[PDB]
Enzyme design. Structure first.
Site, PDB file in Angstrom:
ATOM      1  N   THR A   8       8.683   8.534 -12.477  1.00 27.52           N
ATOM      2  CA  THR A   8       8.996   8.144 -11.115  1.00 27.52           C
ATOM      3  C   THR A   8       8.125   6.986 -10.652  1.00 27.52           C
ATOM      4  O   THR A   8       8.593   6.105  -9.931  1.00 27.52           O
ATOM      5  CB  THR A   8       8.850   9.341 -10.168  1.00 27.52           C
ATOM      6  OG1 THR A   8       9.769  10.359 -10.580  1.00 27.52           O
ATOM      7  CG2 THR A   8       9.158   8.941  -8.739  1.00 27.52           C
TER       8      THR A   8
ATOM      9  N   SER B  16     -10.770   6.906   2.885  1.00 23.39           N
ATOM     10  CA  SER B  16     -11.662   6.723   4.028  1.00 23.39           C
ATOM     11  C   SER B  16     -11.711   7.766   5.150  1.00 23.39           C
ATOM     12  O   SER B  16     -12.674   7.795   5.931  1.00 23.39           O
ATOM     13  CB  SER B  16     -11.359   5.357   4.644  1.00 23.39           C
ATOM     14  OG  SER B  16     -10.031   5.329   5.143  1.00 23.39           O
TER      15      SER B  16
ATOM     16  N   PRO C 173     -17.662  -4.461   9.265  1.00 23.70           N
ATOM     17  CA  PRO C 173     -17.273  -5.606   8.434  1.00 23.70           C
ATOM     18  C   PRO C 173     -18.357  -6.088   7.472  1.00 23.70           C
ATOM     19  O   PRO C 173     -18.168  -6.081   6.256  1.00 23.70           O
ATOM     20  CB  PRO C 173     -16.916  -6.674   9.464  1.00 23.70           C
ATOM     21  CG  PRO C 173     -16.388  -5.871  10.607  1.00 23.70           C
ATOM     22  CD  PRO C 173     -17.383  -4.734  10.687  1.00 23.70           C
ATOM     23  N   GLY C 174     -19.492  -6.509   8.028  1.00 26.16           N
ATOM     24  CA  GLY C 174     -20.584  -7.013   7.214  1.00 26.16           C
ATOM     25  C   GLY C 174     -21.104  -6.058   6.156  1.00 26.16           C
ATOM     26  O   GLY C 174     -21.211  -6.420   4.981  1.00 26.16           O
TER      27      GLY C 174
ATOM     28  N   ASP D 263       0.842  -1.186   0.000  1.00 26.00           N
ATOM     29  CA  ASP D 263       0.000   0.000   0.000  1.00 26.00           C
ATOM     30  C   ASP D 263       0.882   1.243   0.000  1.00 26.00           C
ATOM     31  O   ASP D 263       1.028   1.913   1.023  1.00 26.00           O
ATOM     32  CB  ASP D 263      -0.912  -0.005   1.226  1.00 26.00           C
ATOM     33  CG  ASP D 263      -1.952   1.082   1.169  1.00 26.00           C
ATOM     34  OD1 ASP D 263      -1.933   1.850   0.182  1.00 26.00           O
ATOM     35  OD2 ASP D 263      -2.780   1.160   2.100  1.00 26.00           O
ATOM     36  N   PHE D 264       1.456   1.553  -1.157  1.00 25.40           N
ATOM     37  CA  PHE D 264       2.345   2.698  -1.285  1.00 25.40           C
ATOM     38  C   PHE D 264       1.650   3.944  -1.841  1.00 25.40           C
ATOM     39  O   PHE D 264       2.255   5.012  -1.927  1.00 25.40           O
ATOM     40  CB  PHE D 264       3.543   2.311  -2.158  1.00 25.40           C
ATOM     41  CG  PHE D 264       4.473   1.305  -1.506  1.00 25.40           C
ATOM     42  CD1 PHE D 264       4.250   0.869  -0.203  1.00 25.40           C
ATOM     43  CD2 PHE D 264       5.593   0.831  -2.185  1.00 25.40           C
ATOM     44  CE1 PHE D 264       5.139  -0.023   0.414  1.00 25.40           C
ATOM     45  CE2 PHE D 264       6.479  -0.055  -1.575  1.00 25.40           C
ATOM     46  CZ  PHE D 264       6.252  -0.481  -0.275  1.00 25.40           C
ATOM     47  N   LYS D 265       0.377   3.800  -2.196  1.00 32.73           N
ATOM     48  CA  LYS D 265      -0.420   4.907  -2.740  1.00 32.73           C
ATOM     49  C   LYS D 265       0.435   5.775  -3.647  1.00 32.73           C
ATOM     50  O   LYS D 265       0.562   6.994  -3.454  1.00 32.73           O
ATOM     51  CB  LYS D 265      -0.996   5.745  -1.598  1.00 32.73           C
ATOM     52  CG  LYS D 265      -1.850   4.927  -0.659  1.00 32.73           C
ATOM     53  CD  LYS D 265      -2.362   5.735   0.507  1.00 32.73           C
ATOM     54  CE  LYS D 265      -2.943   4.799   1.537  1.00 32.73           C
ATOM     55  NZ  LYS D 265      -1.909   3.850   2.024  1.00 32.73           N
TER      56      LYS D 265
HETATM   57  O1  LIG Z   1      -8.449   5.325   2.004  1.00 33.75           O
HETATM   58  C1  LIG Z   1      -7.608   4.633   2.544  1.00 33.75           C
HETATM   59  C2  LIG Z   1      -6.536   3.894   1.907  1.00 33.75           C
HETATM   60  C3  LIG Z   1      -5.724   3.112   2.653  1.00 33.75           C
HETATM   61  N1  LIG Z   1      -5.835   3.010   4.069  1.00 33.75           N
HETATM   62  C4  LIG Z   1      -4.842   2.182   4.780  1.00 33.75           C
HETATM   63  O2  LIG Z   1      -5.526   1.071   5.325  1.00 33.75           O
HETATM   64  C5  LIG Z   1      -5.109   0.813   6.684  1.00 33.75           C
HETATM   65  C6  LIG Z   1      -6.252   1.087   7.640  1.00 33.75           C
HETATM   66  O3  LIG Z   1      -5.803   0.689   8.943  1.00 33.75           O
HETATM   67  P1  LIG Z   1      -6.747   0.697  10.207  1.00 33.75           P
HETATM   68  O4  LIG Z   1      -7.546   1.973  10.283  1.00 33.75           O
HETATM   69  O5  LIG Z   1      -7.668  -0.617  10.172  1.00 33.75           O
HETATM   70  O6  LIG Z   1      -5.811   0.563  11.377  1.00 33.75           O
HETATM   71  C7  LIG Z   1      -3.837   1.640   6.822  1.00 33.75           C
HETATM   72  O7  LIG Z   1      -2.695   0.888   6.408  1.00 33.75           O
HETATM   73  C8  LIG Z   1      -4.071   2.806   5.917  1.00 33.75           C
HETATM   74  O8  LIG Z   1      -2.872   3.468   5.522  1.00 33.75           O
HETATM   75  C9  LIG Z   1      -6.885   3.690   4.750  1.00 33.75           C
HETATM   76  O9  LIG Z   1      -7.080   3.549   5.937  1.00 33.75           O
HETATM   77  N2  LIG Z   1      -7.656   4.509   3.948  1.00 33.75           N
HETATM   78  O1  LIG Z   2       4.978  17.599  -9.348  1.00 34.05           O
HETATM   79  C1  LIG Z   2       6.016  17.028  -9.094  1.00 34.05           C
HETATM   80  C2  LIG Z   2       6.535  16.709  -7.777  1.00 34.05           C
HETATM   81  C3  LIG Z   2       7.727  16.086  -7.655  1.00 34.05           C
HETATM   82  N1  LIG Z   2       8.513  15.688  -8.768  1.00 34.05           N
HETATM   83  C4  LIG Z   2       9.771  14.966  -8.496  1.00 34.05           C
HETATM   84  O2  LIG Z   2      10.831  15.816  -8.876  1.00 34.05           O
HETATM   85  C5  LIG Z   2      11.867  15.086  -9.581  1.00 34.05           C
HETATM   86  C6  LIG Z   2      11.934  15.572 -11.022  1.00 34.05           C
HETATM   87  O3  LIG Z   2      13.060  14.926 -11.647  1.00 34.05           O
HETATM   88  P1  LIG Z   2      13.496  15.254 -13.125  1.00 34.05           P
HETATM   89  O4  LIG Z   2      12.300  15.333 -14.028  1.00 34.05           O
HETATM   90  O5  LIG Z   2      14.370  16.586 -13.115  1.00 34.05           O
HETATM   91  O6  LIG Z   2      14.384  14.114 -13.509  1.00 34.05           O
HETATM   92  C7  LIG Z   2      11.499  13.622  -9.328  1.00 34.05           C
HETATM   93  O7  LIG Z   2      12.128  13.105  -8.149  1.00 34.05           O
HETATM   94  C8  LIG Z   2      10.015  13.646  -9.183  1.00 34.05           C
HETATM   95  O8  LIG Z   2       9.506  12.517  -8.479  1.00 34.05           O
HETATM   96  C9  LIG Z   2       8.087  16.011 -10.097  1.00 34.05           C
HETATM   97  O9  LIG Z   2       8.780  15.774 -11.063  1.00 34.05           O
HETATM   98  N2  LIG Z   2       6.838  16.625 -10.171  1.00 34.05           N
END
Ligand SMILES: O=c1ccn([C@@H]2O[C@H](COP(=O)(O)O)[C@@H](O)[C@H]2O)c(=O)[nH]1
Ligand SMILES: O=c1ccn([C@@H]2O[C@H](COP(=O)(O)O)[C@@H](O)[C@H]2O)c(=O)[nH]1
Lengths: 218, 217
Positions: free
Chosen positions: A72, A120, A182-183, A63-65
């Site tokens: 990038t 959420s 849950p349900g 979950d890196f969103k």
């Molecule tokens: O809209 C979103 C998207 C992802 N999470 C993720 O889901 C988990 C919810 O955890 P918890 O509230 O059951 O502890 C966390 O890892 C959180 O970052 C949310 O809660 N809301």
């Molecule tokens: O709106 C945004 C916010 C952040 N970055 C970040 O800035 C750097 C731009 O790199 P470059 O296009 O000069 O190679 C990257 O680390 C990228 O993730 C963007 O390019 N755009």
């Protein structure tokens, strides 16, 4: 779609390796799918993914969103899949090109992308909610098959389900700690994501068993 | 924040050897390095301390934090614990999510940078229409550091208008994405440059050229 045991996904957000491993191992018999995020990964390293694989027979959702520019996003996805993650969660708000980048890497690397449409927490109402329906529609048009929607807003989760169709896979966080039930959530979502309600309980195993018992008919 | 030569290096190489070598090749031109997930998820968060040990540069963690409040707090804590001086946060997820980051930042004495409008084409779909309001939200929350697009000078200018001349503004999108160093600095305090430098056959010469082109500012 992935076969999530008991329709329950553990959100392992503990930030200690020993605690994360202990808790996951204790609920091992009730869950075969674990969602790992930045709290644990930034504290213990991406190698924690391999360790969970080694110790548990569990599917891993990162979950890196992802919410960067296309170039990038590709790097982030590649690094994550190289680490052994089965799937990755990506933010839809940064637009189609950013999502497409993730799908391209997922296709090339044989993994899956989950699209986060609406969040959420309360703040999600400020900007994300108003664009959520279009983000979902965008996902459908991009060929996205896996989605993430809010357990905290049933009506919104129901709308998301409609947009993506019965065939799409939908997982939903916000169950327990955040107020979701849950349900009710499983009326629309294929699986629920539960973190604190389980990992902060005196007996995580009992907490997980209790949740599953409450949705037994589902 | 006093950024040397108004130039921030976006170190997105994913090999520890290359990242350290290249950053070292341009060390005389910068004192501020932006590290993101490409490097951190490939080599680990311990890489931040390594950069401080070898270069002493200030570190901005471009993690574009975009989670719920509770989790944002955990991400910032982990990030500042690793030695980051500042963290970039997405404003799109709402005020509560931004406040969560501001809370940890205050507690650990670090800085939060609010990303309001992104530089890639896709930013036009949903982010752009909310960008001005996101910036206003930042002002209401007391945010003083912001990130805006080099690729859209008129949008960068609007962002500067909203936050005032006292706020600090950095801007990515210079070079690879089409943004011009000099034009960007008309509004931003510092420019972020990645590929135009780290992919250059001679990184040092690349940085020197960019700085030469903006010597006037
Ligand atoms: O809209 C979103 C998207 C992802 N999470 C993720 O889901 C988990 C919810 O955890 P918890 O509230 O059951 O502890 C966390 O890892 C959180 O970052 C949310 O809660 N809301
Ligand atoms: O709106 C945004 C916010 C952040 N970055 C970040 O800035 C750097 C731009 O790199 P470059 O296009 O000069 O190679 C990257 O680390 C990228 O993730 C963007 O390019 N755009």
């Amino acid at each position: 779609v992935m076969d999530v045991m008991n329709r329950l996904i553990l959100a392992m957000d503990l930030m200690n390796r020993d605690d994360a491993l202990r808790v996951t191992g204790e609920v091992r018999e009730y869950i075969d799918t674990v969602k790992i995020g930045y709290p644990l990964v930034l504290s213990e390293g991406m190698d924690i993914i391999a360790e969970f694989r080694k110790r548990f027979g569990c599917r891993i959702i990162a979950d890196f969103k992802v919410a960067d520019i296309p170039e990038t996003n590709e790097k982030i996805c590649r690094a994550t899949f190289k680490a052994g993650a089965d799937a990755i969660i990506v933010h839809g708000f940064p637009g189609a090109d950013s999502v497409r980048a993730c799908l391209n890497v997922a296709e090339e690397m044989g993994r899956e992308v989950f699209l986060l449409t609406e969040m959420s927490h309360p703040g999600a109402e400020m900007f994300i909610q108003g664009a959520a329906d279009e983000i979902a529609r965008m996902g459908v048009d991009l060929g996205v098959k896996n989605y993430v929607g809010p357990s905290t807003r049933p009506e919104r989760l129901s709308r998301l389900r409609e947009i993506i169709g019965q065939d799409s896979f939908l997982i939903s966080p916000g169950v327990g700690a955040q107020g979701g039930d849950p349900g009710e959530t499983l009326r629309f979502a294929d699986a629920i994501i539960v973190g604190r309600s389980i990992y902060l309980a005196d007996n995580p195993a009992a907490a997980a068993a209790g949740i599953i018992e409450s949705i037994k008919d589902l």
